[PDB]
Write a protein that binds this DNA or RNA. Structure first.
Ligand SMILES: [Co+2]
Lengths: 52, 370, 65, 69, 61
RNA sequence: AACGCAGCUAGCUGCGAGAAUUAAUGUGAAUUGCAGGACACAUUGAUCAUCGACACUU
RNA sequence: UUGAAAAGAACUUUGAAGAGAGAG
RNA sequence: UUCAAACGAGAACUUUGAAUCGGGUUCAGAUCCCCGAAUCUUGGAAAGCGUCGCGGUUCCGGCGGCGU
């Protein structure tokens, strides 16, 4: 659920979450849009995973 | 006209302000005309006259080859085990930049300096954070190129420290030289593949108590060079059974040759580092601002020449490999990931760029080293 | 060559029907290069795509009667 | 939104802890002073120019000021 | 470098979870490599790292 | 019965978030379509079989 | 239900290709 | 239904032209995303919309002038 997603990303990548939006893809996977707090930025963070 | 300093810093054009640059090894074309020799064009007939019509084009290749010679001598001077190839590549690139006095696209590096280790064959250069220390029991393929106004010259050699590899090195060198002498005007590429395979396979390698047979890497092959175009669309093979296309007057070729104590084929193994914008594709729409910005940056700075991620970090651009793969999917830039053989195998490469002059065959990349 | 996508996008941006969308007949190459609403907004400012006027239906005949 | 009608109230509601910023809008006939609070956007409208600057000198320090004009 | 069952049996509980945690962390990174451009050598590491998860988790259980 | 699990995998098959398998024992250098990964083979180990330990989503 | 074994037809040539002609 | 053009080896048939609310945002999602407001006037002109221009030509998703 949205609460479980928010806690997981916070302790996994040491960031803060403003809100999370989720939907179930037609293939059956759940996609979550996790918006970070204004003080954090998604650019430098997504470098840390290596995605960006 | 001044002289070059001990650590090469004087630009090549400063060494030859007259404008004429040292000629490569002039060689007569093979007597493949059923015994009749080709020593009938060296006379100063209209053949030489139309050769003079393209003299200014050759001089650029001559200066590029001279710069390559000085750069590779400098590299041979200080290369030693124990130092990572990030600083090796930095030294090679900065020395080549100073010697060629690069300015935009009128002069500069043709493609990133490849330094393939052990089973790796080509198209590998360290990325940011790549911590790979060299070892005494290593073999490295130093492939780098320089260009003047797009006149690309491509040359490559192999460096060794353990003396157990000299047999493989001499085998690959003999194969490359045989391909050089076999090449000519109005000759089929399958013939040069025939010659290369028939010279190179007749060698035996004794490494670590195990006897191997050196074989060509049938996957790789030579290529033809064009104006700002490293691959002009003609590939000279190094194995039997190829195309029957001829080589014509006025063309330039890179006669590459690879030899491995493995399976003779290569695949993609590690992270891609070499990239190349497509010369043939035209205008393809992009939807990402970052992707558009990176595209215009690379087409301004690297044009159609090959580039590496180090060259993009050197430009201050970060967070870019995303848009880079985006251009890759859009078909603008083609990635060239490293080609590697089976683990524990060893590969050697020697490369030279040859010129098909109307009167003779000049191997501009020839040097006293090899 | 294929301008079905660009006419749909232009109508959405111009907030008019597709019958009112005009594509330049001898500039077709770079409208074909437009594939985003941003690129459509590029062209309607440069005049390559403009909104055709509404077909005239005068009420003067009925007003006179 | 809420309309602040008399001058004294506006500098009070600007001093509240939830007041994040004040935005000054310059119109042809008036100047609007809008303060963004937690639950409402309070607006004070003065029709004469000379009071606008004198009030502009008297905002509490540290409160973010944005000039629309 | 190869995780083996019998050497983990005498190891204490606390660092077994520590051993479990990083192996999960590398597994997450490998999944990141898969969605992006991924080296074949990298794409070979999920199966082995997945089995170590089972190997370690079998031990604690 | 349903839904998921393979680097590339739709069906069949096998398996259950430890998901084309974990552990242990026997065996003893492969699996294989490709690649990668392996592989002192005892200072002990690929594969396969067996299967008594563990685990087994709705 | 090809063939003992893919050894599953390199290469040249016509055609935009499907399809051919040589060759193997 | 017709004429012309483009792409294309090839065209009656393809394409182009001619006969809890407000605002933005995609190629495909908006009362769900972003911004701003909440549960006659403030909102409100800053927005939006018309026209007239200046920059830029995969970058500027940048600027202004009038009018509502
Ligand atoms: Co080359």
């Amino acid at each position: 659920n949205k609460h479980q997603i928010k806690q997981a990303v916070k302790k996994l990548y040491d960031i803060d979450v403003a809100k999370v939006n989720t939907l179930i893809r037609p293939d059956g996977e759940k996609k979550a849009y996790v918006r970070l707090a204004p003080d954090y930025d998604a650019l430098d963070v997504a470098n840390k995973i290596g995605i960006i | 006209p001044k002289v070059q300093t001990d650590p090469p810093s004087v630009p090549i054009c400063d060494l030859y302000p007259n404008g004429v640059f040292p000629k490569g090894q002039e060689c007569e074309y093979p007597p493949t005309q059923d015994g009749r020799t080709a020593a009938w064009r060296t006379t100063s007939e209209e053949k030489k006259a139309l050769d003079q019509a393209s003299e200014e084009i050759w001089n650029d290749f001559r200066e590029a080859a001279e710069a390559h010679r000085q750069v590779r001598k400098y590299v041979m001077s200080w290369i030693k085990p124990g130092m990572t190839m990030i600083e090796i590549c930095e030294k090679l690139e900065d020395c080549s930049r100073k010697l060629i006095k690069e300015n935009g696209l009128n002069a500069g590096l043709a493609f990133p300096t490849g330094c393939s280790l052990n089973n790796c064959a080509a198209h590998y250069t360290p990325n940011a954070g790549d911590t790979t220390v060299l070892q005494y029991d290593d073999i490295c393929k130093i492939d780098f190129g320089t260009h003047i106004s797009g006149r690309i010259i491509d040359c490559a050699f192999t460096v060794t420290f353990n003396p157990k590899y000299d047999t493989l090195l001499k085998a690959v060198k003999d194969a490359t030289n045989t391909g050089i002498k076999c090449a000519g005007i109005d000759v089929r590429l399958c013939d040069v593949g025939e010659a290369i395979q028939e010279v190179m396979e007749s060698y035996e390698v004794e490494i670590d108590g195990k006897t191997y047979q050196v074989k060509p890497i049938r996957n790789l092959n030579g290529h033809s060079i064009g104006q700002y175009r490293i691959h002009a669309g003609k590939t000279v093979p190094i194995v039997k059974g190829g195309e029957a296309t001829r080589m014509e007057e006025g063309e330039v070729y890179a006669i590459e040759t690879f030899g491995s104590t493995g399976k003779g084929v290569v695949h993609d193994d590690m992270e891609c580092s070499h990239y190349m914008k497509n010369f043939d594709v035209g205008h393809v729409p992009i939807r990402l601002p970052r992707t558009k910005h990176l595209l215009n940056v690379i087409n301004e700075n690297f044009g159609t020449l090959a580039f590496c991620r180090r060259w993009l970090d050197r430009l201050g651009e970060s967070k870019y490999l995303m848009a880079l793969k985006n251009l890759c999917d859009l078909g603008i830039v083609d990635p060239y990931p490293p080609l590697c053989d089976i683990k524990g195998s060893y590969t050697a490469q020697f490369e030279h760029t040859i010129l098909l002059r109307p009167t003779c065959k000049e191997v501009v990349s020839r040097g006293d080293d090899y | 060559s294929m301008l079905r996508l660009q006419k749909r996008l232009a109508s959405s941006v111009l907030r008019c029907g597709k019958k009112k969308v005009w594509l330049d007949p001898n500039e077709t190459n770079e409208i074909a290069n437009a594939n985003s609403r941003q690129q459509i907004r590029k062209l309607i400012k440069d005049g390559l795509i403009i909104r055709k006027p509404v077909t005239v239906h005068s009420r003067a005949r009925c007003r006179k009667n | 939104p809420r309309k602040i009608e008399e001058i004294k109230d506006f500098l009070l509601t600007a001093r509240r802890k939830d007041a994040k910023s004040v935005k000054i809008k310059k119109n042809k006939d008036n100047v609007k002073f809008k303060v963004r609070c937690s639950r409402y956007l309070y607006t004070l409208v003065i029709t004469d120019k000379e009071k606008a600057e004198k009030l502009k000198q008297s905002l509490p320090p540290g409160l973010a000021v944005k000039e629309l004009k | 470098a190869k995780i083996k069952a019998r050497d983990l049996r005498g190891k204490k509980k606390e660092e077994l979870l520590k051993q479990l945690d990083d192996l999960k962390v590398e597994l997450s990174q490998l999944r990141v490599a898969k969605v992006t451009g991924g080296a074949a050598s990298k794409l070979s590491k999920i199966r082995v790292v997945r089995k170590s998860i089972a190997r370690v988790l079998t031990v604690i259980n």
